[PDB]
Design an enzyme around this catalytic site. Sequence first.
Site, PDB file in Angstrom:
ATOM      1  N   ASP B  35       0.825  -1.205   0.000  1.00 45.54           N
ATOM      2  CA  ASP B  35       0.000   0.000   0.000  1.00 45.54           C
ATOM      3  C   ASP B  35       0.859   1.255   0.000  1.00 45.54           C
ATOM      4  O   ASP B  35       1.753   1.417   0.835  1.00 45.54           O
ATOM      5  CB  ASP B  35      -0.953   0.023   1.198  1.00 45.54           C
ATOM      6  CG  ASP B  35      -1.987   1.130   1.097  1.00 45.54           C
ATOM      7  OD1 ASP B  35      -2.714   1.153   0.079  1.00 45.54           O
ATOM      8  OD2 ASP B  35      -2.082   1.967   2.030  1.00 45.54           O
ATOM      9  N   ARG B  80       4.467   1.381  -6.353  1.00 40.41           N
ATOM     10  CA  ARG B  80       3.370   1.622  -7.287  1.00 40.41           C
ATOM     11  C   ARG B  80       3.392   0.592  -8.427  1.00 40.41           C
ATOM     12  O   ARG B  80       2.345   0.078  -8.821  1.00 40.41           O
ATOM     13  CB  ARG B  80       3.445   3.054  -7.834  1.00 40.41           C
ATOM     14  CG  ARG B  80       2.165   3.589  -8.481  1.00 40.41           C
ATOM     15  CD  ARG B  80       1.181   4.150  -7.457  1.00 40.41           C
ATOM     16  NE  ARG B  80       0.193   5.038  -8.068  1.00 40.41           N
ATOM     17  CZ  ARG B  80      -0.812   5.623  -7.419  1.00 40.41           C
ATOM     18  NH1 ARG B  80      -0.989   5.420  -6.119  1.00 40.41           N
ATOM     19  NH2 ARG B  80      -1.652   6.414  -8.071  1.00 40.41           N
ATOM     20  N   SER B 152     -17.872  -9.542 -10.003  1.00 41.24           N
ATOM     21  CA  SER B 152     -18.446  -8.483  -9.177  1.00 41.24           C
ATOM     22  C   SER B 152     -19.205  -9.108  -8.017  1.00 41.24           C
ATOM     23  O   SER B 152     -19.588 -10.271  -8.072  1.00 41.24           O
ATOM     24  CB  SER B 152     -19.368  -7.582 -10.000  1.00 41.24           C
ATOM     25  OG  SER B 152     -20.447  -8.305 -10.573  1.00 41.24           O
ATOM     26  N   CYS B 153     -19.424  -8.341  -6.960  1.00 41.41           N
ATOM     27  CA  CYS B 153     -20.135  -8.869  -5.810  1.00 41.41           C
ATOM     28  C   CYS B 153     -21.613  -8.948  -6.134  1.00 41.41           C
ATOM     29  O   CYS B 153     -22.371  -9.624  -5.431  1.00 41.41           O
ATOM     30  CB  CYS B 153     -19.912  -8.003  -4.583  1.00 41.41           C
ATOM     31  SG  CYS B 153     -20.624  -6.395  -4.785  1.00 41.41           S
ATOM     32  N   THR B 154     -22.010  -8.240  -7.193  1.00 42.87           N
ATOM     33  CA  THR B 154     -23.370  -8.309  -7.726  1.00 42.87           C
ATOM     34  C   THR B 154     -23.549  -9.661  -8.381  1.00 42.87           C
ATOM     35  O   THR B 154     -24.551 -10.325  -8.152  1.00 42.87           O
ATOM     36  CB  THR B 154     -23.662  -7.219  -8.780  1.00 42.87           C
ATOM     37  OG1 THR B 154     -23.140  -5.953  -8.346  1.00 42.87           O
ATOM     38  CG2 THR B 154     -25.161  -7.117  -9.042  1.00 42.87           C
ATOM     39  N   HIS B 180     -28.631  -0.432  -5.680  1.00 44.29           N
ATOM     40  CA  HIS B 180     -27.266  -0.660  -5.220  1.00 44.29           C
ATOM     41  C   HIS B 180     -26.794   0.470  -4.310  1.00 44.29           C
ATOM     42  O   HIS B 180     -26.980   1.646  -4.618  1.00 44.29           O
ATOM     43  CB  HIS B 180     -26.316  -0.807  -6.411  1.00 44.29           C
ATOM     44  CG  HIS B 180     -25.076  -1.585  -6.103  1.00 44.29           C
ATOM     45  ND1 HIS B 180     -24.125  -1.145  -5.207  1.00 44.29           N
ATOM     46  CD2 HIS B 180     -24.630  -2.774  -6.571  1.00 44.29           C
ATOM     47  CE1 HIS B 180     -23.146  -2.030  -5.137  1.00 44.29           C
ATOM     48  NE2 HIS B 180     -23.428  -3.028  -5.954  1.00 44.29           N
ATOM     49  N   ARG B 198     -22.572   9.510 -13.216  1.00 48.40           N
ATOM     50  CA  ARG B 198     -21.832   9.203 -12.000  1.00 48.40           C
ATOM     51  C   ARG B 198     -21.050  10.407 -11.509  1.00 48.40           C
ATOM     52  O   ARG B 198     -20.457  10.383 -10.434  1.00 48.40           O
ATOM     53  CB  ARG B 198     -20.901   8.027 -12.260  1.00 48.40           C
ATOM     54  CG  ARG B 198     -20.973   6.952 -11.199  1.00 48.40           C
ATOM     55  CD  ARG B 198     -21.230   5.592 -11.830  1.00 48.40           C
ATOM     56  NE  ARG B 198     -20.297   5.333 -12.923  1.00 48.40           N
ATOM     57  CZ  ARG B 198     -19.402   4.350 -12.935  1.00 48.40           C
ATOM     58  NH1 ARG B 198     -19.328   3.501 -11.907  1.00 48.40           N
ATOM     59  NH2 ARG B 198     -18.589   4.216 -13.984  1.00 48.40           N
ATOM     60  N   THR B 211     -24.407  -2.105 -15.352  1.00 46.08           N
ATOM     61  CA  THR B 211     -23.862  -3.166 -14.505  1.00 46.08           C
ATOM     62  C   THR B 211     -23.265  -4.273 -15.369  1.00 46.08           C
ATOM     63  O   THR B 211     -23.841  -4.649 -16.390  1.00 46.08           O
ATOM     64  CB  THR B 211     -24.909  -3.735 -13.515  1.00 46.08           C
ATOM     65  OG1 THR B 211     -24.264  -4.673 -12.644  1.00 46.08           O
ATOM     66  CG2 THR B 211     -26.092  -4.413 -14.231  1.00 46.08           C
ATOM     67  N   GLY B 212     -22.100  -4.774 -14.976  1.00 52.01           N
ATOM     68  CA  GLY B 212     -21.466  -5.864 -15.714  1.00 52.01           C
ATOM     69  C   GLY B 212     -22.166  -7.174 -15.433  1.00 52.01           C
ATOM     70  O   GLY B 212     -22.149  -8.096 -16.242  1.00 52.01           O
ATOM     71  N   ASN B 316     -22.787  -5.665  -0.013  1.00 52.56           N
ATOM     72  CA  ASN B 316     -21.821  -5.492  -1.104  1.00 52.56           C
ATOM     73  C   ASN B 316     -20.373  -5.692  -0.686  1.00 52.56           C
ATOM     74  O   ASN B 316     -19.593  -6.292  -1.418  1.00 52.56           O
ATOM     75  CB  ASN B 316     -21.998  -4.186  -1.899  1.00 52.56           C
ATOM     76  CG  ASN B 316     -22.730  -3.107  -1.122  1.00 52.56           C
ATOM     77  OD1 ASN B 316     -23.955  -3.000  -1.198  1.00 52.56           O
ATOM     78  ND2 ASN B 316     -21.981  -2.288  -0.384  1.00 52.56           N
TER      79      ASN B 316
END
Lengths: 335, 335, 335, 335
Positions: B35, B80, B152-154, B180, B198, B211-212, B316
């Site tokens: 990080d 990085r 995705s979490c969807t 969402h 957005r 949405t994917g 989510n």
Amino acid sequence: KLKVAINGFGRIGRNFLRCWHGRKDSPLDVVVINDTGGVKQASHLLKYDSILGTFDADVKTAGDSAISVDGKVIKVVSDRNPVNLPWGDMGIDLVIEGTGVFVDRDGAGKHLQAGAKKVLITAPGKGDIPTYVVGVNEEGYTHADTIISNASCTTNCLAPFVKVLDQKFGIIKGTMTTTHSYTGDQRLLDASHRDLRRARAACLNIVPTSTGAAKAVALVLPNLKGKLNGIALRVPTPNVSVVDLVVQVSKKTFAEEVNAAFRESADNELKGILSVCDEPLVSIDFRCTDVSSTIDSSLTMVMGDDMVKVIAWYDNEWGYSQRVVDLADIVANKW
Amino acid sequence: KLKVAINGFGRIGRNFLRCWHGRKDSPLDVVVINDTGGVKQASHLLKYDSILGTFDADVKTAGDSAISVDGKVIKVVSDRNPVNLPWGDMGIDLVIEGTGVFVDRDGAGKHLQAGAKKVLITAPGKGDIPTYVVGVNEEGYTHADTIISNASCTTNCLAPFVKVLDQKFGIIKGTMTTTHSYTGDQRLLDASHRDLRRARAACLNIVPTSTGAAKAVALVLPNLKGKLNGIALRVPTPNVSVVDLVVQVSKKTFAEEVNAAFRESADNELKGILSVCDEPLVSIDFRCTDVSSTIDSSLTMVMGDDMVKVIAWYDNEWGYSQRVVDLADIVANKW
Amino acid sequence: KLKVAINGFGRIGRNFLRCWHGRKDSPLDVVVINDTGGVKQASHLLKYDSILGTFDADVKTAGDSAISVDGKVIKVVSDRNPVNLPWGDMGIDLVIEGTGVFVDRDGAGKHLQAGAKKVLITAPGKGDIPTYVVGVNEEGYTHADTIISNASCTTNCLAPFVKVLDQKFGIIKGTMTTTHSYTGDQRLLDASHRDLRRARAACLNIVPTSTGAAKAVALVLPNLKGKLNGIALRVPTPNVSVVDLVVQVSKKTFAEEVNAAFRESADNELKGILSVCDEPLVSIDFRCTDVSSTIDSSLTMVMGDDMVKVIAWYDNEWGYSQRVVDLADIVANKW
Amino acid sequence: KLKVAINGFGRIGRNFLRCWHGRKDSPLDVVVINDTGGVKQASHLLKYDSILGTFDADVKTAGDSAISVDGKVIKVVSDRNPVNLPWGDMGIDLVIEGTGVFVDRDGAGKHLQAGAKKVLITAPGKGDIPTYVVGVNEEGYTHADTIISNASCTTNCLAPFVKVLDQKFGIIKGTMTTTHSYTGDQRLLDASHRDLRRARAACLNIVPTSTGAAKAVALVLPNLKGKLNGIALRVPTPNVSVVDLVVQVSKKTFAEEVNAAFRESADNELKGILSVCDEPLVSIDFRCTDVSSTIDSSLTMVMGDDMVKVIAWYDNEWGYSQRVVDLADIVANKW
């Protein structure tokens, strides 16, 4: 022209007042308000509002039983029990019934006891009461009708384009979710409510609820009896709601052709009632729009070849009140 | 047991850490975090969080390149450019790729250049990259796979019950909206964003987006290629999202029978992954639940006889991170 | 009249544009905008805004480097490095510097390199740069000044009545909290930020932060050097902020006398800058008000006999932009 | 040990129940709840809550007049008029009065008519009623007291450190704002309310209101009669509030010395009641903390040399309920 009284001076009531007041050459004249809240409160709340914003008018008390709106004095009376109200004496012709409680012919019927000639309820009735939606079935209003309804503002959003869809592709069956701005009766904090879903913090929750809107559509578009069902999800936006309607049609179509049909109607039989938006807007862009229903055209989808999906934005408060006046001055206009 | 490194220590990353840390007998050992944010920040943000709430652990800095979590020292490095990271030297086996940027085989491929043995991306890849969903297709994970995805979490919410529906009634076509919780990349105030939807105030708006998740489902349930489409509406709740799926099936069914099929699976092949809720709960009751997807059974509808509608709640952030660990310790478990 | 360029077309910039555009007989003419965002985006975002609401104008693209606002074509150029901009060639006289980054004489100085005659920064500078507040010290603007500042909008709220208080009762010492609408740089979800307070979900939190506003006041009211200190609490309202100032004065006074002094000034030396509100209003009633600062008179308290407390509402975005134009057309007006 | 009844099972009531239930070796036994809401509702709402989150217990109905909490059956009775309740027969010793309505000796006095031995009101009384705050004046509780109060949770936040300040530097005069999480009685949408400020949308507004808390302090710290005044600003955060207290003291001091004095007490006479936080936290980090009041030490300021400012966070719901139990089991403990 038409002698008009407003019963109930909460959101719907006040909303009607400022709606009527902004009109070109209103056939309507509003002379009285029945509100138990008092004249100081009715004034203040009429002038200031978090959703509609400050009213662009000189609103103030005129003595202790009336308010002025730029000079124009409106009377304010205050009985809880409608049979009492001095309608007769004041020669009232049309009552806007906005209390929400007197929805049957037996509750609303109390207004014609005070000696009022016609009543317009701002909510669906419990049977035997004709509902009407401008753009959908307004043609059918007889003058003989003493008690009329205007349905939910969700039904006022949904019926117009359901009409178009039904007329042009022919709805077979379909289902629908109403992402809906939170609403007065819900709970600020988790507390007592007949609906255990609705007892819950409104500002923190996606809260599921029943909507009358789907079956309610059938009342104004009989061809659709038992073809639609729905649910609502209240969300923490104050105003501006969206309907998310999925239908199966009989005429094989595609997203682009559907949108063309709405535009066809938005420029013709539904000009001023339905719009089609081709811009990537968000909910808060539909604040204070004058139409019942705006189709978000970029979002229309057809899978394939006959399951059509349509997203429409509506202003729950303002758009609906606009219709209430549209209905009220049809009542007036053909006397 | 498994030597594990976490690339990126933002929401997803930190989320994985506290998820892993709460486990019975983890086969996983997390030794390093990459990080750029710094050790002070990584500590603080790991300990405190508005959504998951304060972490129940002694989280603090241990010198200037490590944090302790109840004694357990985790290393913190800071490049990085991923090709640099001392993976090789530290003998890392599995990288949790949570930066969001390195989604292709060419970006994520940079991790195996640092000398890492396997990579798990916490987001859909751009082709040639196998996605996996626990409960759906996890059986198909070969050890040969060097780069894997978790979607995705969807999709992690939707795929499990789409499986059940497909297996048992047979999806023909269908469409779906994801109400969402708003998400990191959106705009606090109206400002610059590639998506003009957005760019707009997240806390004030129902914001529509692509949405994917719908096409993404096909990747893990091939039987459904080009049978689903979707849209999302971001709303001002911070966490906890709902999927609103309408399908047409081939086996004539009814609301109650559908719900029975989910329960069938919630107690068997999807125990711990799918739940069925028979309680009138609201969104914020699904906070911190361990399952990918909870069906709201009271809300299931069937019109009629073959158009089925299903509402499922998902956490989510937490539910998804739970799966990431579920995937990571399958990777570990069969070595 | 005055050749005006706007550097940066984010909130502050766009805000200035619609502010200028609504004016009676503007001495100002805006001919160019420098924005890297693009012409499509600049148009859209100028037309639609969640806080100021839809702009009441025909806003659209005119070719690929300009927008029209009701016909009136404004040019749009796009360099990141200010020394490049074709100011000289376009004969620009006054640059509105709204990027926020170029606050020193060395960063803002880059504009006069492009050949611009004067620069107005919409934020406090880092020393050697004269700040100005209309109503407070505007009298002191020499034309010789090439670089001027307008301070924070908090200072624009606070300075006017601090003046009144100081002039009339004589501030000895005092302290102040700014309950403040959340602001662009804060975090939608808990994520990376130099300020660990400001890393945190903006919509869920009362977030404490430092405010420049207290020391910043001293710059425009020198009599108050080191007599004030402050803190801010960002809260989840989008716009409209309140200052909560406690001072100790030397002239023994009482709540009612203080309020009289503000009214004295609101009708005279600060007409249009300071207001006094005697109505029980809430934050969202001060949306789109034209004044720097409205005193909430019902809330003024004096304990006793010399510790005075004063609550003033300000529109953070609109009220400030109004001043920016007020400053800009003083610059223009005395040429 | 102590026979305990809870009157009113709304937020405060339920809050007390789960507070009591989480205790080491409670001297208290809760046997009955008086709630008109019903057993189904009381169960559900006890189990689920948007602020405190799901209760970690098996909460369910046990027949039709009781709930179980992990087996432990609690009785539920349902009279509106308190004189009726079968207290006597059930041998109740202590009533937690959480309805909010029965605050006087004449309203609360109705409980000892049902034959209850002592009453604890969870709100300030209207004179002649002794208020008590644990940490402040709890020493003064005689057993002779049949009716006692616990004040506002704001007073429960403020009194402890006001004590410290008064004891150590000597408050002369002072004033105070309570940035306060919105509260049950406020309005979701603009509607009828005795307070025209409080009629207004709670989720959209900084709403100013009167606070009892300042004068209320004098009741428990008599030395401060007429030395403090206050105001509150309700804000759209659900829970977690901050007090912003400015005082003038007689002992010349400095920010750092003040903070030392609080720490002195947080480790001694106020351990468990007052904390001092040296971390840059935000409001939602104080959720579910067990103390009345946490000083935000980084924020303490002294101007100069005698005007001290102090910011303390409190959990409005949980922290207060914690005290209610602290008071209730002093009542029990010395019988």
